[PDB]
Amino acid sequence: GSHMATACKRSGEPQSDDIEASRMKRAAAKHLIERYYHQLTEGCGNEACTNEFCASCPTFLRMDNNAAAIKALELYKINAKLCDPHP
Ligand SMILES: [Zn+2]
């Protein structure tokens, strides 16, 4: 049919059984990634926003959401600079 109406164990679950599980792990990463993803295309709203990776820069220059999502991944792994930290 269209979708296997199930969400159990000891049964013939599809390969999508692992998908719903794996996304939870990387969703934790996504929470920090959103800071960079939004910073790249949306911005921050800061005076000292002048960062290599920012939309809210005093230059007013940004990227598209696809360009920002892939780069936010690349910023997550290096832990890039962020106008909204926590002391
Ligand atoms: Zn910024």
PDB file of N, CA and C and ligand atoms in Angstrom:
ATOM      1  N   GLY A   1       0.827  -1.233   0.000  1.00  0.00           N
ATOM      2  CA  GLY A   1       0.000   0.000   0.000  1.00  0.00           C
ATOM      3  C   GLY A   1       0.849   1.266   0.000  1.00  0.00           C
ATOM      4  N   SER A   2       0.340   2.342   0.637  1.00  0.00           N
ATOM      5  CA  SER A   2       1.019   3.652   0.694  1.00  0.00           C
ATOM      6  C   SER A   2       2.024   3.700   1.866  1.00  0.00           C
ATOM      7  N   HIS A   3       1.541   3.364   3.084  1.00  0.00           N
ATOM      8  CA  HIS A   3       2.368   3.359   4.319  1.00  0.00           C
ATOM      9  C   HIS A   3       2.039   2.111   5.158  1.00  0.00           C
ATOM     10  N   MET A   4       3.084   1.477   5.725  1.00  0.00           N
ATOM     11  CA  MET A   4       2.929   0.330   6.635  1.00  0.00           C
ATOM     12  C   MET A   4       2.415   0.846   7.995  1.00  0.00           C
ATOM     13  N   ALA A   5       1.104   0.648   8.262  1.00  0.00           N
ATOM     14  CA  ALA A   5       0.460   1.079   9.515  1.00  0.00           C
ATOM     15  C   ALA A   5       0.963   0.221  10.698  1.00  0.00           C
ATOM     16  N   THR A   6       2.098   0.638  11.285  1.00  0.00           N
ATOM     17  CA  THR A   6       2.788  -0.106  12.347  1.00  0.00           C
ATOM     18  C   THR A   6       3.835   0.792  13.034  1.00  0.00           C
ATOM     19  N   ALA A   7       4.221   0.404  14.261  1.00  0.00           N
ATOM     20  CA  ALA A   7       5.236   1.099  15.080  1.00  0.00           C
ATOM     21  C   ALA A   7       5.580   0.216  16.293  1.00  0.00           C
ATOM     22  N   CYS A   8       5.921  -1.048  16.012  1.00  0.00           N
ATOM     23  CA  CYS A   8       6.120  -2.089  17.038  1.00  0.00           C
ATOM     24  C   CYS A   8       7.450  -2.829  16.820  1.00  0.00           C
ATOM     25  N   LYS A   9       7.695  -3.867  17.642  1.00  0.00           N
ATOM     26  CA  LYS A   9       8.864  -4.760  17.517  1.00  0.00           C
ATOM     27  C   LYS A   9       8.397  -6.224  17.461  1.00  0.00           C
ATOM     28  N   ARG A  10       9.351  -7.132  17.148  1.00  0.00           N
ATOM     29  CA  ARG A  10       9.099  -8.586  16.935  1.00  0.00           C
ATOM     30  C   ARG A  10       8.140  -8.811  15.750  1.00  0.00           C
ATOM     31  N   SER A  11       8.171  -7.859  14.820  1.00  0.00           N
ATOM     32  CA  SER A  11       7.312  -7.811  13.637  1.00  0.00           C
ATOM     33  C   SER A  11       8.148  -7.374  12.420  1.00  0.00           C
ATOM     34  N   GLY A  12       7.551  -7.491  11.220  1.00  0.00           N
ATOM     35  CA  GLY A  12       8.232  -7.209   9.953  1.00  0.00           C
ATOM     36  C   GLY A  12       8.212  -5.725   9.619  1.00  0.00           C
ATOM     37  N   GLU A  13       8.905  -4.942  10.454  1.00  0.00           N
ATOM     38  CA  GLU A  13       9.033  -3.482  10.299  1.00  0.00           C
ATOM     39  C   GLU A  13       9.892  -3.135   9.060  1.00  0.00           C
ATOM     40  N   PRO A  14       9.548  -2.041   8.305  1.00  0.00           N
ATOM     41  CA  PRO A  14      10.336  -1.609   7.120  1.00  0.00           C
ATOM     42  C   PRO A  14      11.701  -0.990   7.513  1.00  0.00           C
ATOM     43  N   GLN A  15      12.469  -0.541   6.505  1.00  0.00           N
ATOM     44  CA  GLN A  15      13.787   0.099   6.722  1.00  0.00           C
ATOM     45  C   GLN A  15      13.611   1.518   7.330  1.00  0.00           C
ATOM     46  N   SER A  16      12.392   2.081   7.166  1.00  0.00           N
ATOM     47  CA  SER A  16      12.011   3.400   7.708  1.00  0.00           C
ATOM     48  C   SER A  16      11.946   3.392   9.255  1.00  0.00           C
ATOM     49  N   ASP A  17      11.953   2.178   9.846  1.00  0.00           N
ATOM     50  CA  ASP A  17      11.995   1.968  11.310  1.00  0.00           C
ATOM     51  C   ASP A  17      13.249   2.626  11.935  1.00  0.00           C
ATOM     52  N   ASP A  18      14.360   2.580  11.190  1.00  0.00           N
ATOM     53  CA  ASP A  18      15.661   3.126  11.630  1.00  0.00           C
ATOM     54  C   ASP A  18      15.736   4.639  11.408  1.00  0.00           C
ATOM     55  N   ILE A  19      14.986   5.125  10.408  1.00  0.00           N
ATOM     56  CA  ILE A  19      14.986   6.545   9.985  1.00  0.00           C
ATOM     57  C   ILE A  19      14.452   7.458  11.104  1.00  0.00           C
ATOM     58  N   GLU A  20      13.292   7.063  11.674  1.00  0.00           N
ATOM     59  CA  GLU A  20      12.635   7.781  12.792  1.00  0.00           C
ATOM     60  C   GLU A  20      13.538   7.829  14.053  1.00  0.00           C
ATOM     61  N   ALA A  21      14.443   6.836  14.167  1.00  0.00           N
ATOM     62  CA  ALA A  21      15.383   6.721  15.288  1.00  0.00           C
ATOM     63  C   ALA A  21      16.619   7.613  15.075  1.00  0.00           C
ATOM     64  N   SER A  22      17.192   7.557  13.854  1.00  0.00           N
ATOM     65  CA  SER A  22      18.482   8.205  13.521  1.00  0.00           C
ATOM     66  C   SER A  22      18.371   9.740  13.523  1.00  0.00           C
ATOM     67  N   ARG A  23      17.188  10.244  13.112  1.00  0.00           N
ATOM     68  CA  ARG A  23      16.914  11.690  13.054  1.00  0.00           C
ATOM     69  C   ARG A  23      16.935  12.338  14.445  1.00  0.00           C
ATOM     70  N   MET A  24      16.588  11.571  15.502  1.00  0.00           N
ATOM     71  CA  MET A  24      16.559  12.083  16.895  1.00  0.00           C
ATOM     72  C   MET A  24      17.975  12.474  17.374  1.00  0.00           C
ATOM     73  N   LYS A  25      18.967  11.663  16.957  1.00  0.00           N
ATOM     74  CA  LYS A  25      20.387  11.836  17.337  1.00  0.00           C
ATOM     75  C   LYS A  25      20.958  13.124  16.714  1.00  0.00           C
ATOM     76  N   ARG A  26      20.701  13.288  15.406  1.00  0.00           N
ATOM     77  CA  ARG A  26      21.204  14.426  14.610  1.00  0.00           C
ATOM     78  C   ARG A  26      20.354  15.697  14.837  1.00  0.00           C
ATOM     79  N   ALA A  27      19.115  15.523  15.360  1.00  0.00           N
ATOM     80  CA  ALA A  27      18.222  16.642  15.739  1.00  0.00           C
ATOM     81  C   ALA A  27      18.827  17.465  16.893  1.00  0.00           C
ATOM     82  N   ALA A  28      19.554  16.766  17.781  1.00  0.00           N
ATOM     83  CA  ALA A  28      20.296  17.383  18.892  1.00  0.00           C
ATOM     84  C   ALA A  28      21.369  18.348  18.347  1.00  0.00           C
ATOM     85  N   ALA A  29      22.086  17.883  17.302  1.00  0.00           N
ATOM     86  CA  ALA A  29      23.087  18.682  16.574  1.00  0.00           C
ATOM     87  C   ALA A  29      22.430  19.883  15.880  1.00  0.00           C
ATOM     88  N   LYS A  30      21.248  19.624  15.268  1.00  0.00           N
ATOM     89  CA  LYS A  30      20.450  20.622  14.519  1.00  0.00           C
ATOM     90  C   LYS A  30      20.151  21.873  15.356  1.00  0.00           C
ATOM     91  N   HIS A  31      19.903  21.693  16.662  1.00  0.00           N
ATOM     92  CA  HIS A  31      19.558  22.798  17.588  1.00  0.00           C
ATOM     93  C   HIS A  31      20.648  23.905  17.606  1.00  0.00           C
ATOM     94  N   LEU A  32      21.921  23.475  17.547  1.00  0.00           N
ATOM     95  CA  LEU A  32      23.092  24.382  17.514  1.00  0.00           C
ATOM     96  C   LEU A  32      23.318  24.865  16.057  1.00  0.00           C
ATOM     97  N   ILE A  33      23.083  23.950  15.090  1.00  0.00           N
ATOM     98  CA  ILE A  33      23.178  24.228  13.635  1.00  0.00           C
ATOM     99  C   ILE A  33      22.219  25.367  13.214  1.00  0.00           C
ATOM    100  N   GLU A  34      21.034  25.455  13.868  1.00  0.00           N
ATOM    101  CA  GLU A  34      20.011  26.488  13.574  1.00  0.00           C
ATOM    102  C   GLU A  34      20.550  27.897  13.857  1.00  0.00           C
ATOM    103  N   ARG A  35      21.437  28.005  14.854  1.00  0.00           N
ATOM    104  CA  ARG A  35      22.073  29.281  15.213  1.00  0.00           C
ATOM    105  C   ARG A  35      22.914  29.816  14.046  1.00  0.00           C
ATOM    106  N   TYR A  36      23.650  28.908  13.382  1.00  0.00           N
ATOM    107  CA  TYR A  36      24.525  29.253  12.247  1.00  0.00           C
ATOM    108  C   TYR A  36      23.712  29.407  10.947  1.00  0.00           C
ATOM    109  N   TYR A  37      22.780  28.460  10.704  1.00  0.00           N
ATOM    110  CA  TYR A  37      21.905  28.425   9.502  1.00  0.00           C
ATOM    111  C   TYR A  37      21.118  29.729   9.368  1.00  0.00           C
ATOM    112  N   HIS A  38      20.516  30.152  10.482  1.00  0.00           N
ATOM    113  CA  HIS A  38      19.742  31.388  10.531  1.00  0.00           C
ATOM    114  C   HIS A  38      20.702  32.575  10.445  1.00  0.00           C
ATOM    115  N   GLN A  39      21.843  32.510  11.159  1.00  0.00           N
ATOM    116  CA  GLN A  39      22.870  33.585  11.144  1.00  0.00           C
ATOM    117  C   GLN A  39      23.348  33.924   9.713  1.00  0.00           C
ATOM    118  N   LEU A  40      23.396  32.904   8.848  1.00  0.00           N
ATOM    119  CA  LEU A  40      23.906  33.009   7.466  1.00  0.00           C
ATOM    120  C   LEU A  40      22.901  33.658   6.490  1.00  0.00           C
ATOM    121  N   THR A  41      21.581  33.457   6.704  1.00  0.00           N
ATOM    122  CA  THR A  41      20.541  33.914   5.742  1.00  0.00           C
ATOM    123  C   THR A  41      19.550  34.916   6.383  1.00  0.00           C
ATOM    124  N   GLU A  42      19.115  34.629   7.614  1.00  0.00           N
ATOM    125  CA  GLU A  42      18.211  35.494   8.406  1.00  0.00           C
ATOM    126  C   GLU A  42      18.995  36.666   9.038  1.00  0.00           C
ATOM    127  N   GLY A  43      20.024  36.311   9.827  1.00  0.00           N
ATOM    128  CA  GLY A  43      20.840  37.276  10.559  1.00  0.00           C
ATOM    129  C   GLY A  43      20.918  36.986  12.062  1.00  0.00           C
ATOM    130  N   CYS A  44      21.078  38.062  12.859  1.00  0.00           N
ATOM    131  CA  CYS A  44      21.267  37.997  14.321  1.00  0.00           C
ATOM    132  C   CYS A  44      20.492  39.154  14.989  1.00  0.00           C
ATOM    133  N   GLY A  45      20.704  40.385  14.471  1.00  0.00           N
ATOM    134  CA  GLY A  45      20.168  41.610  15.081  1.00  0.00           C
ATOM    135  C   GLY A  45      21.132  42.199  16.111  1.00  0.00           C
ATOM    136  N   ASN A  46      22.419  42.308  15.732  1.00  0.00           N
ATOM    137  CA  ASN A  46      23.508  42.777  16.624  1.00  0.00           C
ATOM    138  C   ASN A  46      24.286  43.915  15.939  1.00  0.00           C
ATOM    139  N   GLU A  47      24.860  44.829  16.741  1.00  0.00           N
ATOM    140  CA  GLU A  47      25.708  45.928  16.231  1.00  0.00           C
ATOM    141  C   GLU A  47      27.092  45.392  15.804  1.00  0.00           C
ATOM    142  N   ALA A  48      27.677  44.521  16.641  1.00  0.00           N
ATOM    143  CA  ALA A  48      28.989  43.892  16.392  1.00  0.00           C
ATOM    144  C   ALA A  48      28.787  42.545  15.670  1.00  0.00           C
ATOM    145  N   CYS A  49      27.913  42.567  14.651  1.00  0.00           N
ATOM    146  CA  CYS A  49      27.525  41.377  13.890  1.00  0.00           C
ATOM    147  C   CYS A  49      28.543  41.029  12.803  1.00  0.00           C
ATOM    148  N   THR A  50      29.501  41.953  12.546  1.00  0.00           N
ATOM    149  CA  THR A  50      30.535  41.801  11.508  1.00  0.00           C
ATOM    150  C   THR A  50      31.342  40.479  11.693  1.00  0.00           C
ATOM    151  N   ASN A  51      30.825  39.433  11.055  1.00  0.00           N
ATOM    152  CA  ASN A  51      31.409  38.093  11.050  1.00  0.00           C
ATOM    153  C   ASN A  51      31.480  37.612   9.598  1.00  0.00           C
ATOM    154  N   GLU A  52      32.465  36.747   9.302  1.00  0.00           N
ATOM    155  CA  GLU A  52      32.647  36.145   7.960  1.00  0.00           C
ATOM    156  C   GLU A  52      31.400  35.365   7.537  1.00  0.00           C
ATOM    157  N   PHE A  53      30.719  34.822   8.545  1.00  0.00           N
ATOM    158  CA  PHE A  53      29.542  33.989   8.388  1.00  0.00           C
ATOM    159  C   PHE A  53      28.343  34.661   9.087  1.00  0.00           C
ATOM    160  N   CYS A  54      27.744  35.668   8.413  1.00  0.00           N
ATOM    161  CA  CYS A  54      26.588  36.429   8.945  1.00  0.00           C
ATOM    162  C   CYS A  54      25.811  37.147   7.823  1.00  0.00           C
ATOM    163  N   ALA A  55      24.497  37.328   8.063  1.00  0.00           N
ATOM    164  CA  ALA A  55      23.565  38.045   7.179  1.00  0.00           C
ATOM    165  C   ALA A  55      23.367  39.474   7.686  1.00  0.00           C
ATOM    166  N   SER A  56      23.320  39.578   9.029  1.00  0.00           N
ATOM    167  CA  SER A  56      23.109  40.828   9.781  1.00  0.00           C
ATOM    168  C   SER A  56      24.406  41.665   9.876  1.00  0.00           C
ATOM    169  N   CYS A  57      25.448  41.292   9.089  1.00  0.00           N
ATOM    170  CA  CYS A  57      26.694  42.074   8.971  1.00  0.00           C
ATOM    171  C   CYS A  57      26.386  43.537   8.567  1.00  0.00           C
ATOM    172  N   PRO A  58      27.219  44.535   9.010  1.00  0.00           N
ATOM    173  CA  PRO A  58      27.078  45.956   8.579  1.00  0.00           C
ATOM    174  C   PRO A  58      27.336  46.184   7.059  1.00  0.00           C
ATOM    175  N   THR A  59      27.666  45.103   6.324  1.00  0.00           N
ATOM    176  CA  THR A  59      27.750  45.097   4.849  1.00  0.00           C
ATOM    177  C   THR A  59      26.371  44.802   4.200  1.00  0.00           C
ATOM    178  N   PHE A  60      25.497  44.105   4.966  1.00  0.00           N
ATOM    179  CA  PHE A  60      24.192  43.573   4.509  1.00  0.00           C
ATOM    180  C   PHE A  60      24.388  42.632   3.304  1.00  0.00           C
ATOM    181  N   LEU A  61      24.947  41.451   3.600  1.00  0.00           N
ATOM    182  CA  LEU A  61      25.229  40.392   2.614  1.00  0.00           C
ATOM    183  C   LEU A  61      24.880  39.037   3.233  1.00  0.00           C
ATOM    184  N   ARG A  62      24.097  38.227   2.503  1.00  0.00           N
ATOM    185  CA  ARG A  62      23.656  36.902   2.969  1.00  0.00           C
ATOM    186  C   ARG A  62      23.559  35.910   1.811  1.00  0.00           C
ATOM    187  N   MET A  63      23.240  34.667   2.173  1.00  0.00           N
ATOM    188  CA  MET A  63      23.097  33.539   1.247  1.00  0.00           C
ATOM    189  C   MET A  63      21.664  33.005   1.287  1.00  0.00           C
ATOM    190  N   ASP A  64      21.391  32.055   0.395  1.00  0.00           N
ATOM    191  CA  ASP A  64      20.096  31.353   0.320  1.00  0.00           C
ATOM    192  C   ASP A  64      20.025  30.265   1.400  1.00  0.00           C
ATOM    193  N   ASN A  65      18.808  29.748   1.666  1.00  0.00           N
ATOM    194  CA  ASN A  65      18.559  28.776   2.757  1.00  0.00           C
ATOM    195  C   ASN A  65      19.288  27.437   2.524  1.00  0.00           C
ATOM    196  N   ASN A  66      19.404  27.021   1.249  1.00  0.00           N
ATOM    197  CA  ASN A  66      20.150  25.799   0.859  1.00  0.00           C
ATOM    198  C   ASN A  66      21.655  25.995   1.109  1.00  0.00           C
ATOM    199  N   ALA A  67      22.148  27.189   0.722  1.00  0.00           N
ATOM    200  CA  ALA A  67      23.560  27.593   0.891  1.00  0.00           C
ATOM    201  C   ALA A  67      23.929  27.758   2.374  1.00  0.00           C
ATOM    202  N   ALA A  68      22.932  28.159   3.173  1.00  0.00           N
ATOM    203  CA  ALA A  68      23.098  28.425   4.603  1.00  0.00           C
ATOM    204  C   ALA A  68      23.018  27.140   5.422  1.00  0.00           C
ATOM    205  N   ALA A  69      22.159  26.200   4.993  1.00  0.00           N
ATOM    206  CA  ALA A  69      21.972  24.905   5.667  1.00  0.00           C
ATOM    207  C   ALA A  69      23.242  24.051   5.576  1.00  0.00           C
ATOM    208  N   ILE A  70      23.782  23.917   4.342  1.00  0.00           N
ATOM    209  CA  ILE A  70      25.008  23.130   4.080  1.00  0.00           C
ATOM    210  C   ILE A  70      26.228  23.752   4.783  1.00  0.00           C
ATOM    211  N   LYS A  71      26.285  25.102   4.819  1.00  0.00           N
ATOM    212  CA  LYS A  71      27.396  25.820   5.453  1.00  0.00           C
ATOM    213  C   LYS A  71      27.278  25.755   6.982  1.00  0.00           C
ATOM    214  N   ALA A  72      26.042  25.729   7.508  1.00  0.00           N
ATOM    215  CA  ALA A  72      25.774  25.622   8.965  1.00  0.00           C
ATOM    216  C   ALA A  72      26.291  24.294   9.531  1.00  0.00           C
ATOM    217  N   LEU A  73      26.227  23.250   8.693  1.00  0.00           N
ATOM    218  CA  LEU A  73      26.832  21.935   8.974  1.00  0.00           C
ATOM    219  C   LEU A  73      28.365  22.081   9.077  1.00  0.00           C
ATOM    220  N   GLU A  74      28.937  22.827   8.117  1.00  0.00           N
ATOM    221  CA  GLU A  74      30.392  23.078   8.043  1.00  0.00           C
ATOM    222  C   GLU A  74      30.869  24.005   9.177  1.00  0.00           C
ATOM    223  N   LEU A  75      29.948  24.830   9.686  1.00  0.00           N
ATOM    224  CA  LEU A  75      30.206  25.727  10.814  1.00  0.00           C
ATOM    225  C   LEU A  75      30.057  24.996  12.147  1.00  0.00           C
ATOM    226  N   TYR A  76      29.176  23.983  12.181  1.00  0.00           N
ATOM    227  CA  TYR A  76      28.912  23.191  13.395  1.00  0.00           C
ATOM    228  C   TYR A  76      30.149  22.368  13.789  1.00  0.00           C
ATOM    229  N   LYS A  77      30.734  21.694  12.784  1.00  0.00           N
ATOM    230  CA  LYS A  77      31.885  20.792  12.971  1.00  0.00           C
ATOM    231  C   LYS A  77      33.152  21.550  13.433  1.00  0.00           C
ATOM    232  N   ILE A  78      33.286  22.826  13.033  1.00  0.00           N
ATOM    233  CA  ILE A  78      34.429  23.684  13.435  1.00  0.00           C
ATOM    234  C   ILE A  78      34.067  24.577  14.642  1.00  0.00           C
ATOM    235  N   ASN A  79      32.746  24.681  14.939  1.00  0.00           N
ATOM    236  CA  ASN A  79      32.188  25.605  15.955  1.00  0.00           C
ATOM    237  C   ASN A  79      32.566  27.062  15.588  1.00  0.00           C
ATOM    238  N   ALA A  80      31.888  27.598  14.556  1.00  0.00           N
ATOM    239  CA  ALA A  80      32.146  28.954  14.021  1.00  0.00           C
ATOM    240  C   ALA A  80      31.707  30.052  14.996  1.00  0.00           C
ATOM    241  N   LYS A  81      32.086  31.301  14.686  1.00  0.00           N
ATOM    242  CA  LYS A  81      31.756  32.453  15.531  1.00  0.00           C
ATOM    243  C   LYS A  81      30.273  32.832  15.414  1.00  0.00           C
ATOM    244  N   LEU A  82      29.732  33.290  16.545  1.00  0.00           N
ATOM    245  CA  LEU A  82      28.301  33.489  16.744  1.00  0.00           C
ATOM    246  C   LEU A  82      28.099  34.776  17.565  1.00  0.00           C
ATOM    247  N   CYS A  83      27.228  35.674  17.071  1.00  0.00           N
ATOM    248  CA  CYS A  83      26.952  36.978  17.721  1.00  0.00           C
ATOM    249  C   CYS A  83      26.096  36.824  18.989  1.00  0.00           C
ATOM    250  N   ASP A  84      25.528  35.620  19.185  1.00  0.00           N
ATOM    251  CA  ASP A  84      24.695  35.284  20.353  1.00  0.00           C
ATOM    252  C   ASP A  84      25.329  34.094  21.116  1.00  0.00           C
ATOM    253  N   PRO A  85      26.439  34.330  21.906  1.00  0.00           N
ATOM    254  CA  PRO A  85      27.087  33.277  22.718  1.00  0.00           C
ATOM    255  C   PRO A  85      26.402  33.126  24.104  1.00  0.00           C
ATOM    256  N   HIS A  86      27.118  32.550  25.087  1.00  0.00           N
ATOM    257  CA  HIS A  86      26.623  32.413  26.467  1.00  0.00           C
ATOM    258  C   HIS A  86      27.819  32.383  27.448  1.00  0.00           C
ATOM    259  N   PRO A  87      28.037  33.473  28.261  1.00  0.00           N
ATOM    260  CA  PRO A  87      29.103  33.522  29.286  1.00  0.00           C
ATOM    261  C   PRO A  87      28.688  32.741  30.569  1.00  0.00           C
TER     262      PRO A  87
HETATM  263 ZN    ZN B   1      25.962  38.022  13.257  1.00  0.00          ZN
END
